[PDB]
Design a protein around this ligand. Structure first.
Ligand SMILES: Nc1ncnc2c1ncn2[C@@H]1O[C@H](COP(=O)(O)OP(=O)(O)O)[C@@H](O)[C@H]1O
Ligand SMILES: Nc1ncnc2c1ncn2[C@@H]1O[C@H](COP(=O)(O)OP(=O)(O)O)[C@@H](O)[C@H]1O
Ligand SMILES: Nc1ncnc2c1ncn2[C@@H]1O[C@H](COP(=O)(O)OP(=O)(O)O)[C@@H](O)[C@H]1O
Ligand SMILES: Nc1ncnc2c1ncn2[C@@H]1O[C@H](COP(=O)(O)OP(=O)(O)O)[C@@H](O)[C@H]1O
Ligand SMILES: Nc1ncnc2c1ncn2[C@@H]1O[C@H](COP(=O)(O)OP(=O)(O)O)[C@@H](O)[C@H]1O
Ligand SMILES: Nc1ncnc2c1ncn2[C@@H]1O[C@H](COP(=O)(O)OP(=O)(O)O)[C@@H](O)[C@H]1O
Ligand SMILES: [Mg+2]
Ligand SMILES: [Mg+2]
Ligand SMILES: [Mg+2]
Ligand SMILES: [Mg+2]
Ligand SMILES: [Mg+2]
Ligand SMILES: [Mg+2]
Lengths: 309, 309, 309, 309, 309, 309
DNA sequence: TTTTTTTTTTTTTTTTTTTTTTTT
């Protein structure tokens, strides 16, 4: 899928240089190709001359030019989608959650945002012919609501062994925004050794709310958030995984999501959740580059997300 | 349990540094590990190149990284749950009140919110064999309804010596929101010396209602409340105690709890109380990450909360 | 349309000099005539007494002097306008999108900026008698929202063949600001071999946000952006194409476009988009040298941009 | 109103010397009278002795000495002023735009700088008894915003014939700063053959911004600009025309014009524009040798600049 | 006042010698006394053994030797001082502008430098009792900002007849630096026939900026400027008049006057002007041999320079 | 302190020879003894015989031979040292300005060079017990900055009577370089009839710059300057007075004094001035035969040079 | 064989928050 970063060791580029690059956070040749020159010179040990040759070798292995739209159409026809467990939602989304972009879920409390993430963390492991991804899951939790018992219950409905299902999920907790950003380097390091398919951030704005307080700290908060979103997009470009994030709401003094224009402009797809009758929930498509606006109904059960019975 | 803060005395850090840190409000190595760097560059005497040292230390002692979900599942099966005195309530809660998270109780007047807190203040001192926690209780009051004469009667039912029961509860009264926030530092200091198991806040919104008035002060109220909730969650993370808070209701213009979206998103479990016939009452699960919705019946007697006769 | 650069090989200029000029990014005689002397001296091979000869010959081939306003009036009556697919919008613009200048579209999320670009990428290929351009399209994407499926649906409505329509669009993705500026040399190389009529940049400011962070890098950011805008205008002068760019908005601490005074002064026409009822949207003329301020309504359908139904 | 340069061949000077002078860029006897000797001894062919004869002969035809202030008052009380189409503006300026000096207009985008230039290009042709000039216009454009449709619309309001109006304006487009300076020699050549009354430069600093970049090229940029301003003032002295230039603004890191101290000291009159309500605009006098500070209001209509209802 | 030159005609000196001296710019006996023998021998028709007697004579008429400081104090106590029209300014300067020395004013655009010169050109004619000088004014303008209209208004405020005020000012315009130096011979010739009391040079540095461009011509520029300043001082010594000159500023790449050390060392008094609130301006003493540093406030009105209110 | 020239009257010598020598400019036997025989030849009236006799005489009256270093060391102990009015300066200079040598001060404009000379002109009359010289002062001015009011103010601070203080200073003004050289003969004649202690030249290079312009005339300027400095040193040797001179600076294309190597080698002590905060100034030792290189601080007040508070 | 001089010039915006309270 990607080009190993060891193939950049020619014409006087040694292994110590590659070790310095890995210590900086780059783990593939694509990561080197996508970075600007001013970024590479902020590493203690990389002189101006090398920074040029490094950029010349990477471009020979990673294509960056012009193609026709027919070629891009053919390539895009081969991306896989992940099933949500509900037929209504799969039809509404055009197949499921798609790899290579960012999907956002928002709503008020107990509307079902964490249950769907739990369901996807299982369906990302199953065979491709039933809507799976045949990969692993990386889960980052900023609120403390992750529950392995739900995973154990869900894995039985899809014919899995609970031991392997629990072994194939990597989990981490974050305590402030700097730690939240720091964890992405470890994620990138782990992604280059085995095959993953999904990343979850639940939720993305909870710690920013209190780490920066009031007017007078707004600009710095928005700048930090923009850096985080750019890093997530770069990971999706490098490894071809799906990315899912959650968000909270506030009242207009009737409810709207938080994070402002930075949040609104950088998400590929946006979905809104609402509370229904009993165990039923309502879903609406709020933003998309290729889908119309519409609505549907789903339900929460002991074994996960499904269709109303 | 935790790691003493005195272990951050390896290199270039003197007892004066730890004294300054303890002045700032930190009494554990976890507290230093969980704080952002921008927060450390605010204590007179710590400037730079030292905050970066205290951060490198306490990460070797306190883990912050990825694990498997099977390890997390094994660790979570060791948490303690405290009995409520009623079989139906314990069955509905999946065991009782669980350490490490936040539970909220809401309802209209004389629905039984304070009697349950009084009963929990006793059940947390008894041995783990019968559903206790073998620890002390910290009780903060903002309405003036704490009555030590109920504790004597309740303790006489569980085979406790009344004088020991009364000596093992710490009590404080608050007069405004700033005082309420300030008491938490003293709580942390006390918890770093002896062993505690439970914390009660009764009630959390009573003083906010009158300290801030009108739409022109609404934004400043919610930020203060968010800071308070974050501090409570940090204490629960540090010491592994249970946290219980109470809340009032209002009319729509049929009744809903006060506090807005900050309150609704920051709580882990939510329970609603209603009035029944005679001494009986009804309880309902309104929000939870691993339990379905259901209801049961309990009763109030001269010896505490129990099952209907 | 343009004078080929091979006509400059006279009176001592050989093929090696033209090869060096081409490698430096010049592909037409007009490009040589528009460059200052200080620019030519910075190319290896051109020393002196040769740049002067090149400039004299280019001025002989390309006119740069005074004419009467009647001649310019006659010449400007032969410019082509491209239809947007909506009659209200075409009337509001005096005919459509005009070749030889720069048009800017700004608004908040999901207001319809990318859908109009997709529609224009098809209408630039149809015959002149129905508002087409009879040429090819070049598309540069910095956000990853280009979707070939919309082109098939839009091409079906205008009587085009989908395979031919997909073969006549050239597509490229950019990953940082240096790469974005670099792609224009390849664009200029491609335009001198076959006929194009439209260029799209979607969007112009997305990567500048994160590549330059905070105050202290603001001047360098603005200077880089000024260079990019000047290159776009030079391409429009050289080849007689239409240029369309998109832009994001920010809050005033009620919304305004980003990019400052450089962006405000560099654009020829400026249009603002707003969200309406259902699938309807509103457009407003914010700046123009020959049109008054006015407003209209348009709509988004499965087959593109059109009039309300 | 000027002495032809053919009067200098009296005793010892021939037609070849005058041809050399004309090729170097001198077209009147006043031009020879105002040039320093070091400049004359720089044309191929002209040596000493001859360079000493011309300088003497010119002094006999162009007076350079002391006079009384009463005589200067009498002469200055016979200068033409050009109407702007608005009565408020004419009152604020003391009659209109003054021949023999330099006027500068600055402001942010779409504040009306180019519309007033378009109106003046028409009013410079009408008879003297209604505020006109009975002359021709020369227009230099560095941004590409010149539109003859506005001229056709404006000429009808004043009773002119549109074909005559279009035949009496000379137009040129500049592509870099060297070309911009080079066009003034052709301007002088043209002005020595027919009667003109106005010159427009719109705008003056647009190409300097990008032709020189950064700290290391600031001195050369300012020196080039000083030469351009001196040449403009020389033309105004030579032929008795009015000179109008436009300028852009930047933010103070609330807005100020660009060009430094050279521009600020070189202009005779300075006016600032601001955006009002609907089609209304505000004008302020920022610098002048004989007028106090004050403000007024004007408006833009389909037929040019006028009074607010 | 001064000793006429005709008195030199003794001991075999004819009128032809005196005419030859007058043709070279010498118009008094003090001028011949102040000149060195080397300069004298550069005149055609005056050779050795003639300069010997020319220098021997004029030493009996003009004294050049030693005296006591008390006598010089007595002589200096009889120097006229002109009034600026403002009491704060007259107090800050010790009485007004002093005859026999050089005063320089510097500042940025529209700080009031030319208005004060216009006011002095009137106050130099009023009787000695009210602070005048009872003489004529000589005015040299290099920028083109002289306005006789202000003189009428200013004269109406001091009880003067406007026509006589306008007839008592001599005005000249300079077109390059050689012409600027040439005009001083005519000034000296005029001053030997009628009584003058003030000389004005408005922007002594404006033409030097462009006449010598860039490094490589700096030495010649400074040498020419030094000659001009020396001639000004000689005139002030010869006729006992006051001398006022103006100057521009540049940015320190927070502003400083131009001209270098040659200008800084040859000015007796230096004053800096700054912009205030409304029509108010601030003045500061920057250099002087007998005054301390201080500040004051003045204002500009339709009748000239005056007190803040 | 000197042998009168009238003491050289012996056999073969008459009054006419002494009168002729006095006319030439020799006033003491030391001057005749120090004059090489070649010099005593252009004096019309003395060719041979007389010159040899005069040289033989004054050898017995003035010692010309070898002495022990101890005798010279003892004789050097009877040297006066004038106070500068500042304690820091007196400490840095080792006591004050010393008689018998040459001191030079240099710096930029308004650095305090003339104020110190004014103060010395007064302190040179104070009694020896408090650092005086009990003599008169000779002042030569080439710029026109001498102000007796400062002397009157300074006299009171030291207990002197201003009427008497003004009568003990001789003042002269120089108009060109030849006159500047000529004044020294009169100075020497004056010093042979009364007791003087100080001599001041302010400044020494102001007229040389303009009397000799540019290259080609160089080295004649330098020969003239060398002669002037040799004459100054001869006076200092003859009469045992202190000598002080001033100097200007130029920029290096950070500033350096003017005069070349002649001035650099001829001076005995060199001091540099710099501007400080408020009325404070900084002094630096740049050259001295027997002193280290240190710094100091002083200030200027209404009564002269003093300590920085 | 000889003997140093003399300063200049401004640039360029960013970025949302947060519910209240029964009546006959
Ligand atoms: N085992 C279970 N069986 C049925 N419903 C459950 C179970 N666990 C949780 N739920 C339901 O899921 C809801 C919580 O949804 P969640 O995704 O945690 O909300 P949020 O949108 O805040 O993330 C609760 O209303 C609860 O009733
Ligand atoms: N000793 C007691 N015996 C029986 N019932 C009691 C006793 N003390 C209080 N109660 C009951 O408890 C109720 C008070 O409930 P409480 O928890 O204080 O209400 P809230 O929900 O406002 O906190 C009263 O209705 C009262 O009847
Ligand atoms: N196939 C389709 N049919 C109908 N509407 C669509 C279709 N695809 C996208 N849309 C609508 O277009 C809108 C997105 O507009 P777009 O131009 O991508 O926004 P932006 O202004 O951010 O570029 C969405 O609201 C979506 O509902
Ligand atoms: N034909 C017209 N009728 C009415 N208003 C017009 C017409 N043409 C242009 N305008 C108005 O003039 C303004 C453009 O001002 P302009 O002078 O070009 O700006 P700038 O100050 O940038 O030069 C626009 O806001 C536009 O609405
Ligand atoms: N008749 C007048 N009445 C009031 N103020 C005037 C008049 N004429 C000129 N001014 C003011 O004088 C100022 C110009 O000052 P000036 O001395 O010309 O500046 P500079 O320092 O550039 O020479 C302007 O700001 C203007 O407002
Ligand atoms: N009477 C006074 N009171 C206070 N300060 C004065 C007085 N006279 C002159 N000065 C200060 O002395 C300084 C002039 O120093 P001076 O020695 O003349 O400079 P230079 O080094 O050019 O000769 C000025 O800055 C001035 O402020
Ligand atoms: Mg939630
Ligand atoms: Mg209650
Ligand atoms: Mg968008
Ligand atoms: Mg504009
Ligand atoms: Mg000015
Ligand atoms: Mg000085």
């Amino acid at each position: 899928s990607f080009v190993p970063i060891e193939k950049l060791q020619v014409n006087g580029i040694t292994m110590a240089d590659v070790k310095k690059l890995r210590e900086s956070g780059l783990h593939t040749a694509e990561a080197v190709a996508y970075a600007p020159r001013k970024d590479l010179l902020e590493i203690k040990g990389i002189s101006e001359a090398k920074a040029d040759k490094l950029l010349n070798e990477a471009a020979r292995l990673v294509p960056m030019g012009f193609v026709t739209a027919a070629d891009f159409h053919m390539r895009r026809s081969e991306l896989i989608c992940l099933t949500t467990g509900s037929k209504n939602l799969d039809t509404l989304l055009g197949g499921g959650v798609e790899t290579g972009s960012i999907t956002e879920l928002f709503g008020e409390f107990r509307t079902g945002k964490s249950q769907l993430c739990h369901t996807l963390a299982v369906t990302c492991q199953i065979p491709l012919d039933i809507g799976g991804g045949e990969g692993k899951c990386l889960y980052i939790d900023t609120e403390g609501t992750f529950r392995p018992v739900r995973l154990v219950s869900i894995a039985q409905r899809f014919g899995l062994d609970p031991d392997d299902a629990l072994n194939n999920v990597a989990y981490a907790r974050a305590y402030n925004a700097d730690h939240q950003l720091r964890l992405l380097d470890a994620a990138a390091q782990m992604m280059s050794e085995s095959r993953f398919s999904l990343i979850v951030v639940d939720s993305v704005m909870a710690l920013y709310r209190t780490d920066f307080s009031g007017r007078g700290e707004l600009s710095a908060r928005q700048m930090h958030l923009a850096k985080f979103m750019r890093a997530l997009q770069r990971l999706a470009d490098q490894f071809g995984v799906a990315v899912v994030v959650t968000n909270q709401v506030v009242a207009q003094v009737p409810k709207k999501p938080i994070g402002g224009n930075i949040m609104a402009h950088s998400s590929t797809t946006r979905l809104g959740f609402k509370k229904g009758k009993g165990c039923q929930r309502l879903c609406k498509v709020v933003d998309s580059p290729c889908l119309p606006e519409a609505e549907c109904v789903f339900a929460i059960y002991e074994d996960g997300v499904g269709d109303p019975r």
